[PDB]
A paper describes a structure:
The Gs protein-coupled adenosine A2A receptor (A2AAR) represents an emerging drug target for cancer immunotherapy. Etrumadenant (3-[2-amino-6-[1-[[6-(2-hydroxypropan-2-yl)pyridin-2-yl]methyl]-4-yl]pyrimidin-4-yl]-2-methylbenzonitrile, also known as AB928) was developed as one of the first dual-acting adenosine A2A/A2B receptor antagonists. It constitutes a unique chemotype featuring a poly-substituted 2-amino-4-phenyl-6-triazolylpyrimidine core structure. Herein, we report two crystal structures of the A2AAR in complex with Etrumadenant, obtained with differently thermostabilized A2AAR constructs.
For the co-crystallization of Etrumadenant, we used the same modification but inserted an additional point mutation (N154ECL2A) to remove a putative glycosylation site on extracellular loop (ECL) 2 of the receptor. This construct is designated A2A-PSB2-bRIL (PSB: Pharmaceutical Sciences Bonn, bRIL refers to thermostabilized apocytochrome b562RIL17). Etrumadenant was well resolved within the orthosteric ligand binding pocket. Importantly, the cyano group forms a direct hydrogen bond to T883.36 (N-O distance 2.8 Å) representing an interaction that has so far not been observed in A2AAR co-crystal structures with various antagonists. The interaction of Etrumadenant with T883.36 by direct hydrogen bonding stabilizes the A2AAR in its inactive state. The 2-aminopyrimidine core is stabilized by π-π stacking interactions to F168ECL2 and forms key anchoring interactions by hydrogen bonding of the N3 and the exocyclic NH2-group to N2536.55. The phenyl ring of Etrumadenant is stabilized by π-π interactions to H2506.52 (T-shaped) and W2466.48 (stacked). The relatively large Etrumadenant molecule requires a significant sidechain movement of Y2717.36. Notably, the cyano group of Etrumadenant in the A2A-PSB2-bRIL structure is slightly tilted, relative to the plane of the phenyl ring, towards the hydroxy group of T883.36 and deviates from the ideal planar orientation by ~8°.
Author numbering: -1 to 208, 1001 to 1042, 1061 to 1106, 219 to 307
């Protein structure tokens, strides 16, 4: 067996590199929100809670991980705390991520009421409430769901540990049924699936709204055809009534729809009197209102929904990379736990899976920079002005 300090040295050098980049990158996220009022919306308060958790990974959870890989003699419950602290920070990120998905779902489903429902003061109260539950979830082992009542006394002796001490190792003190049933299944997988449902519902909503617009637009332009090409009064009235509801429905900028419906009322009135050619010609005045007001709403509405879709995809990539960085390690615990006949994943793979999970704390800054113009532009200023 190769001197264990050769593998540890690599693992540790890598952990530190990752802690450095987690700190830098998420500091930049915070500095960017601090400085650009275009980034000071509720959604980004959760971005900031997320970046704080990732700063805390680099400043505390990674040094803790390095520590608890040595097996050092430690009081069992102090071992548990350096083992479990990172579970808190991770739970924090899961709640931020879920909050964000719900925020954008409210934003696209009821845009009209979002600013009176989703306020900065309520966001901050939700964040605080989430941090406190994260401490309760990730430190639950401290409350007694732990292996400190059944230490490995042979192992503690072979290391000369004091009395009451254990060799301090994540899997020796944190029970694996906590890690699998409670943490993984219930505190991680259930929320990720929820977030999956929510982003589903967001994309469906957006897809339905865009079609509604495109329908309303076609109701508008086809019912005109029916008018130009009629020779009967009632044909004109019928086609106009179907433009008016499709106009009021799209209304749900004002000069544009006032004129439009008013001109439709104008033409409806003419058509009820049997003035076919006089209604057909008043209808034609609508086309002028279409080109100048309605088609510009169609397009800005389309543009806003495409931006929400693009934004929601950017945030779902954050959640997928969270899942990618953490599932291997969860999957390993599931084998450790459910297959006592299987050999334990080898050390080298544990190294790989642990460092992989920690790299998640580096990736969010890059997503913002690659996918969110306002962040990317801010990031450039901060770098230039303070190289
Ligand atoms: C925390 C967590 C979460 C969260 N949040 C989610 C899923 C799984 C885990 C998680 C984490 C760790 C772990 C172990 N170490 C210290 C360390 C470093 C290098 C090598 C070694 C040895 C002794 C070789 O095993 N041990 N750091 N994290 N171990 C396990 N099974 N699960
Ligand atoms: C604000 C931040 C920097 C505070 C950080 C405090 C951290 C590093 C402290 C608080 C609790 C501490 C632990 C409490 C108890 C023990 C048991 C002892 O046998 C070995 C050290 C160990 C495991 C400590 C390690 C350091 C520790 C984790
Ligand atoms: C989420 C994406 C990246 C997929 C990740 C799947 C990974 C974690 C899977 C693929 C193959 C798996 C390994 C296959 C075989 C063994 C041997 C067994 O004795 C312990 C589990 C162990 C060591 C598995 C650990 C988890 C593993 C490495
Ligand atoms: C959406 C997906 C990623 C959710 C997570 C899937 C998890 C729960 C699945 C993926 C593959 C599964 C493992 C496949 C094989 C074995 C070996 C068996 O002897 C014990 C169960 C165990 C260890 C399974 C446990 C559950 C498992 C780890
Ligand atoms: C030690 C571990 C972590 C450090 C915590 C960092 C906390 C981050 C606070 C930064 C901040 O509030 O900026 C965003 C606001 O401007 C939003 O409007
Ligand atoms: C700025 C904020 C900085 C954060 C602090 C950094 C690292 C904490 C990890 C340190 C844990 C070290 C414990 C060592 C120990 O207890 O070793 C004695 C043992 O009994 C065997 O001799
Ligand atoms: C979604 C993930 C849920 C997957 C649940 C996987 C459970 C694995 C299991 O039941 O393993 C039993 C063990 O083999 C006893 O011998
Ligand atoms: C995934 C994120 C990037 C991973 C880059 C390299 C991973 C870091 C350490 C893994 C291997 C460390 C030890 C190598 C084998 C030696 C040993 O196990 O004793
Ligand atoms: C500041 C950066 C700190 C980084 C990691 C601290 C590593 C702690 C080493 C544990 C002691 C090993 C032992 O006592 O046997
Ligand atoms: C800024 C905060 C600085 C934090 C101090 C850093 C970590 C110290 C490393 C702990 C190593 C313990 C020595 C173990 C021993 O002598 O048995
Ligand atoms: C913004 C910071 C939020 C502060 C949250 C503090 C709430 C902590 C909630 C439950 C913690 C449960 C674990 C208690 C550790 C006790 C240590 C011991 O057992 O010796």
């Amino acid at each position: 067996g190769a001197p264990p300090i050769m593998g540890s040295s690599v693992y540790i050098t890598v952990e530190l590199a990752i802690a450095v980049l987690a700190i830098l990158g998420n500091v930049l996220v915070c500095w960017a929100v601090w400085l650009n009022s275009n980034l000071q919306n509720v959604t980004n308060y959760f971005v900031v809670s997320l970046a704080a958790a990732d700063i805390a990974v680099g400043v505390l959870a990674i040094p803790f991980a390095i520590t608890i890989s040595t097996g050092f003699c430690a009081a069992c419950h102090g071992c548990l705390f350096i083992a479990c602290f990172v579970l808190v920070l991770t739970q924090s990120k899961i709640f931020s991520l879920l909050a964000i998905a719900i925020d954008r779902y409210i934003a696209i489903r009821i845009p009209l009421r979002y600013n009176g429902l989703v306020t900065g003061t309520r966001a901050k109260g939700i964040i605080a409430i989430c941090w406190v539950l994260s401490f309760a979830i990730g430190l639950t082992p401290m409350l007694g769901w732990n292996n400190c009542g059944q230490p490995k006394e042979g192992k503690a002796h072979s290391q000369g540990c004091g009395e009451g001490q254990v060799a301090c190792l994540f899997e020796d003190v944190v029970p694996m049924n906590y890690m699998v049933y409670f943490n993984f299944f219930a505190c991680v997988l259930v929320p990720l699936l929820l977030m999956l449902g929510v982003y589903l519902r967001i994309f469906l909503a957006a897809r339905r709204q865009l079609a509604d617009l495109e329908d309303n637009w076609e109701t508008l332009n086809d019912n005109l055809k029916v008018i130009e090409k009629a020779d009967n009064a009632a044909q004109v009235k019928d086609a106009l009534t179907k433009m008016r509801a499709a106009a009021l429905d799209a209304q749900k900028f004002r000069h544009g729809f006032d004129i439009l419906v008013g001109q439709i009322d104008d033409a409806l009135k003419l058509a009820n009197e049997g003035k076919v050619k006089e209604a057909q010609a008043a209808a034609e005045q609508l086309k002028t209102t279409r080109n100048a007001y309605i088609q510009k709403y169609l397009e800005r509405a389309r543009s806003t929904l495409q931006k929400e879709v693009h934004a929601a995809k950017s945030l779902a990539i954050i959640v997928g990379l969270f899942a990618l960085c953490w599932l291997p390690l969860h999957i390993i615990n599931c084998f450790t736990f459910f297959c006592p006949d299987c050999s334990h994943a080898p050390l080298w793979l544990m190294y790989l899976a642990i460092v992989l999970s920690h790299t998640n704390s580096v990736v969010n800054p890059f997503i913002y920079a690659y996918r969110i113009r306002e962040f990317r532009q801010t990031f450039r200023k901060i770098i230039r002005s303070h190289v």
